[model samples]
Target: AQYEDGKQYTTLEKPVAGAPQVLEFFSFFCPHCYQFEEVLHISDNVKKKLPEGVKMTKYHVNFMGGDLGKDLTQAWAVAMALGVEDKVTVPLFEGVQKTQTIRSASDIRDVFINAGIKGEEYDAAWNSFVVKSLVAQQEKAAADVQLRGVPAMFVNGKYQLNPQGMDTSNMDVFVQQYADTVKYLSEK
Candidate 1:
């Protein structure tokens, strides 16, 4: 049995051409996205099983955090440009969705500080061309998707995963099937 288009997934209006990629559209302020990472731990599990040549990319959507949306998105890009996304993602998510303490870019800066990044480094990354461009790209992709809700995952830039179609009752089954669906889509 395999995932089928229109049932388990849906195709984009036009295919996005690139190396095999699994693009995830998420928001740090989203509780469900946080649950996918912290509670279910599905993203990491599925990442371990992705097919060769398939790269996982995350786009932090800026529509959920009110006035802080764009700044939070830039913070994610800054983390990536500084090679500290692993250190930043969880803390940012917690600050935004769990503790709910992050209110400004300064608060985000403190998250980086807690992650061991110097204030100077964070400032530079926040203003650097690479980080700015990364944020721009993320914003563009988010706009292109015109997403209604977040925590969406798309394989090979064309096929979006249907959460309703997956077996969410069991963690093992969900991770395995999620990985399998990504593999199957990557080959298309």
Candidate 2:
């Protein structure tokens, strides 16, 4: 599954060592971003089926900056710092996207509160200078991707969706396409 000139994915000029990164470049407030998780049942697939050394991660795209992007980026940053992303991702997405209520930093904190995370934990991570720097750096990386839209999946930091990205007529094909490709690349 190396680079082919034209394929479902474009190969990266620089790839990571030992493990491939299955990265989702997404924003919390975006519908398509969260939908991939629910629609394709991707969370379970990635968590359960991924090969060793094949890491599934997300980069919070701060592309759409206004009322949503920055706060969500910081929220995701806090989640990353506290290592509570798995606990709070779905809830945060659901609460914000559905109700359209997470417009403030305090609101994001409230979502953390409702998710049973401590306020001190949320505040500490959200305001930490180091964590904020990490969040900014990843946001910058995501912005430099030359992306056209949200919920873009990249396999091994190289392969991105092409025009004939996959057997799209098949049911839920993209997820399997990605999963299969990741397995092929990551297998020992």
Candidate 3:
């Protein structure tokens, strides 16, 4: 499952450094990704059933709109660098999905604050080096991957799961089946 050096790795990559399997990819602005949230939660339960060493790493895809999109993407990268993804992902999701707002940095900050992370800490994390690096990584990914949208997944670099390109009506089923597909792929 080695990824092509300059290409966007498929939704998943083969276990690197003997770290078992990995789930890599997610985005905050995608409605379908939001819709897949519950199924992803259910997948967490399945994770407990995995053999030791398996891990899931999430890479947020950000490359829609213009500067505003980049800013929001940077905010997510910052949250991940600060280890506040759990604290901010859903709130950020809610901000975009429920409120249909999020046009500025202040709005992004408000989402973090409302998500239970302290304002100052959130600010620091948002501006930290890791966050900056993530932003850069995202820019590189967008350019190399030629990504057209968000909510994409890659399993071990062999399979790609994108809800945007699938039948939206059957997404719930597709998501559940996706776990089975991953398990099947992992065993092979």
- What lDDT score belongs to each candidate, Candidate 1 first? 0.81, 0.68, 0.61
For residues 1-188, write the lDDT of model 2, one tens digit per residue: 45244565566566544322666677776786676666666655655667665567776776664767777887888888778888878777877787777777787788789878888877777779978797876666665566657777666556664525566576467667756655554452
Q: What's the candidate order when arranged by decreasing lDDT? A: 1, 2, 3
Per-residue lDDT of 1-188 in model 3, one digit per residue for the tens? 32222232234343223222545555666666676564456346446554567676666665554666667777878777777877777777777777877778899898778877788888888778877887776666444445576565545545554333323366556555555555555555
Best by TM-score: 1
Clashing pairs in 1: none
Candidate 1, 1-188: lDDT as tens digits: 46688766788887666623788888888888988777777677778777776677877888897879889989889988888988988899889887888999889899999989998988988999999899988887766666778888888767888877887788778777877777777777
Write the number of the candidate with greater lDDT, choosing between 1 and 2.
Answer: 1
TM-score of 2: 0.80
Ranking by TM-score: 1, 2, 3
The root-mean-square deviation over C-alpha atoms between each candidate and the true structure, in angstroms, is: 1.7, 3.3, 5.8
Error of 1 at 26 (Å): 0.9
